Amino acid sequence: SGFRKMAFPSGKVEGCMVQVTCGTTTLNGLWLDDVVYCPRHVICTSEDMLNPNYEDLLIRKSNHNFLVQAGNVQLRVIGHSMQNCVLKLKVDTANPKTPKYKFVRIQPGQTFSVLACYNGSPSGVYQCAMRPNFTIKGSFLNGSCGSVGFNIDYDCVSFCYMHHMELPTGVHAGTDLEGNFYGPFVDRQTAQAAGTDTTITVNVLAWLYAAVINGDRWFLNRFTTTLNDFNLVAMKYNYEPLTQDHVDILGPLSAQTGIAVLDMCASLKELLQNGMNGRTILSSALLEDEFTPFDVVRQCSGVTFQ
Amino acid sequence: SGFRKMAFPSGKVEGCMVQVTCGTTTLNGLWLDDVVYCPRHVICTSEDMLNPNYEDLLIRKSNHNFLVQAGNVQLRVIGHSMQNCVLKLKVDTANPKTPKYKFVRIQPGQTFSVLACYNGSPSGVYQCAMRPNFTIKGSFLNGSCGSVGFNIDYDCVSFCYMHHMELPTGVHAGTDLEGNFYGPFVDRQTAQAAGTDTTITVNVLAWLYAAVINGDRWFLNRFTTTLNDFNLVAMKYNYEPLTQDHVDILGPLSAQTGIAVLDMCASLKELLQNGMNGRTILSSALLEDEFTPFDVVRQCSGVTFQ
Numbered sequence: 001s002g003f004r005k006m007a008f009p010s011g012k013v014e015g016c017m018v019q020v021t022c023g024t025t026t027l028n029g030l031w032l033d034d035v036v037y038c039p040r041h042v043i044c045t046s047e048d049m050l051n052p053n054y055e056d057l058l059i060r061k062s063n064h065n066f067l068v069q070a071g072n073v074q075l076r077v078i079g080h081s082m083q084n085c086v087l088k089l090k091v092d093t094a095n096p097k098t099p100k101y102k103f104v105r106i107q108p109g110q111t112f113s114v115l116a117c118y119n120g121s122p123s124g125v126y127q128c129a130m131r132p133n134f135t136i137k138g139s140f141l142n143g144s145c146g147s148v149g150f151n152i153d154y155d156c157v158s159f160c161y162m163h164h165m166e167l168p169t170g171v172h173a174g175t176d177l178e179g180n181f182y183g184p185f186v187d188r189q190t191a192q193a194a195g196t197d198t199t200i201t202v203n204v205l206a207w208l209y210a211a212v213i214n215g216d217r218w219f220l221n222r223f224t225t226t227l228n229d230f231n232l233v234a235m236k237y238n239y240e241p242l243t244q245d246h247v248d249i250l251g252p253l254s255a256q257t258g259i260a261v262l263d264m265c266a267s268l269k270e271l272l273q274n275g276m277n278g279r280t281i282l283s284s285a286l287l288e289d290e291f292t293p294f295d296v297v298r299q300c301s302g303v304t305f306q
Numbered sequence: 307s308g309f310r311k312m313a314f315p316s317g318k319v320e321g322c323m324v325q326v327t328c329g330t331t332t333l334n335g336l337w338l339d340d341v342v343y344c345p346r347h348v349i350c351t352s353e354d355m356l357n358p359n360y361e362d363l364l365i366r367k368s369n370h371n372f373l374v375q376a377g378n379v380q381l382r383v384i385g386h387s388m389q390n391c392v393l394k395l396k397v398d399t400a401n402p403k404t405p406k407y408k409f410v411r412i413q414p415g416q417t418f419s420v421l422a423c424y425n426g427s428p429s430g431v432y433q434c435a436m437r438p439n440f441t442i443k444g445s446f447l448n449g450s451c452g453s454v455g456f457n458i459d460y461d462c463v464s465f466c467y468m469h470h471m472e473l474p475t476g477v478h479a480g481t482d483l484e485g486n487f488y489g490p491f492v493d494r495q496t497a498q499a500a501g502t503d504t505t506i507t508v509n510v511l512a513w514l515y516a517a518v519i520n521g522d523r524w525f526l527n528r529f530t531t532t533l534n535d536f537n538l539v540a541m542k543y544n545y546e547p548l549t550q551d552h553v554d555i556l557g558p559l560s561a562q563t564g565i566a567v568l569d570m571c572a573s574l575k576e577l578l579q580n581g582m583n584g585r586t587i588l589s590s591a592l593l594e595d596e597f598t599p600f601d602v603v604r605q606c607s608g609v610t611f612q
Contacts, residue, residue: 001476004445006430009421011317071612115315121610124312125431137589139310141608170307170521215476283443285591302447304427306377 003282007113008152010125015097019120021067028117028146032098036089038146039164041187049189084179085187101157103177108132109200112149129290133195134183135171154305199289201239202246206293209253211282213300225266233269249293309516309588313419314458316431321403325426327373334423334452338404342395344452345470347493355495390485391493407463409483414438415506418455435596439501440489441477460611505595507545508552512599515559517588519606531572539575555599
């Protein structure tokens with residue numbers, strides 16, 4: 001029993017974290033087989049970042065201009081390419097610590113673990129949700145660029161996120177590992193508006209199920225609701241609209257706890273229209289939306305990996 | 307910028323996690339050099355746990371009765387000892403993946419990362435506080451026993467906690483790595499009362515400083531307070547009494563933000579006596595007490611390890 005925001009174990013990803021230095025700037029890189037992946041703004045200074053021409057800036061660099069360190073080893077760069085917003089540095093040596101891995105572009109609403117790194121050195125690990133507006137609310141200091149978010153299913157590391165910047169608004173934006181930004185953002189130091197954000201309704205429902213499994217039951221009522229009726233309430237409170245695909249994803253949680261999805265919706269509408277009345281759910285006084293239905297099932301059943 | 311509940315990277319600890327099976331029961335063990343550490347109730351069944359005589363039960367076992375698996379390797383037990391509530395299993399092979407490490411007994415109020423494991427296999431990692439009443443509010447399913455909490459400073463893994471049981475009340479209790487329980491608990495399946503718990507006041511203050519560093523400032527006031535006056539409020543709201551040792555530990559945070567500790571106290575008393583008024587601090591509507599002043603400084607400055 002008990003419910004926690006849990007990160008994936010970060011072992012397999014720590015062995016891939018390296019330090020990339022091009023002249024001034026140093027940030028983190030990801031060393032898989034014999035390629036190092038890092039944000040291309042490693043070739044920028046801080047004034048370059050106002051309006052950079054990455055094409056021109058990278059023509060000014062050669063293989064030997066990229067200093068890449070993996071702990072103690074200084075690594076040997078023998079080929080450099082630009083794919084969208086990431087730099088691919090070809091290296092002399094394959095990483096003996098390369099896990100089985102995939103590159104994945106995730107969906108808004110899905111979660112992942114971030115390994116925050118500085119100078120190629122892991123600092124700590126935390127769980128994140130990709131907001132509906134393609135930002136993440138992370139913890140990233142100067143030099144954290146190149147840090148990666150990832151999922152693990154048994155033996156495979158699915159890399160989904162690389163950190164590139166912090167918006168003036170304080171939230172964070174980055175790319176997949178092919179270098180395509182999530183959201184409308186660009187790697188330029190200018191004002192960039194994130195969309196209006198909303199709450200991930202299917203995730204709040206999963207968390208309510210997790211709460212029932214763990215004994216917090218006060219929010220359950222015998223009222224019920226329709227899907228279309230619940231969605232009028234969702235729209236009023238800036239919740240993502242619930243679809244039948246979401247109901248179906250909540251199927252196993254429904255079946256374990258014996259509470260139909262539309263009964264949990266009627267519980268949720270009541271929470272939205274009346275608050276918690278100084279009570280808490282799983283020791284929180286807000287509605288939590290960073291647990292997918294898969295996260296709840298893995299934690300409430302004990303799925304492990306390697 | 308940004309502030310998250312961050313766990314330590316779990317790489318160095320994953321390589322020590324093994325699976326220990328004695329007849330019926332299987333749980334996790336910790337393999338350092340050539341000794342495996344696990345809870346001694348691995349030699350119990352579920353009825354043994356009502357009132358076990360560990361002395362007698364362990365006399366019934368031999369070296370070859372302990373099946374210990376490290377991933378694929380089946381490990382060779384050649385000596386078994388009982389130290390308080392932990393079993394020490396001597397093994398044929400030293401762990402090539404043994405990190406630099408210490409055994410530490412921590413203080414109530416300190417925090418640590420837990421690597422939740424099942425069958426010797428890591429499931430995920432989260433950050434914990436040792437409550438003033440020596441429980442922890444974790445996420446532990448059946449078979450999670452033997453999981454360990456730990457800290458890391460640069461290259462050293464300081465093991466402080468091993469999980470042994472879940473109380474009927476839903477909270478968790480365990481030992482240091484010498485096998486001495488934290489708190490008044492025993493490894494027996496009986497009703498066991500945890501003390502009255504309280505809130506870790508020095509930690510709530512550290513988190514308020516973290517909030518100021520990150521731009522949340524609405525709770526600051528120009529009122530102030532004395533230490534003795536603040537402590538009357540603390541006692542009314544079941545907060546741990548603030549001492550001068552606590553004020554001194556908050557020194558660096560005080561100096562970074564320019565807010566004296568007693569000014570933050572007057573902010574806190576106001577929060578305690580008036581609530582948040584539907585506002586949030588670092589995206590939370592409760593006062594957070596799982597960040598030590600060291601945790602805040604490490605995250606707000608970027609301390610790394612290996």
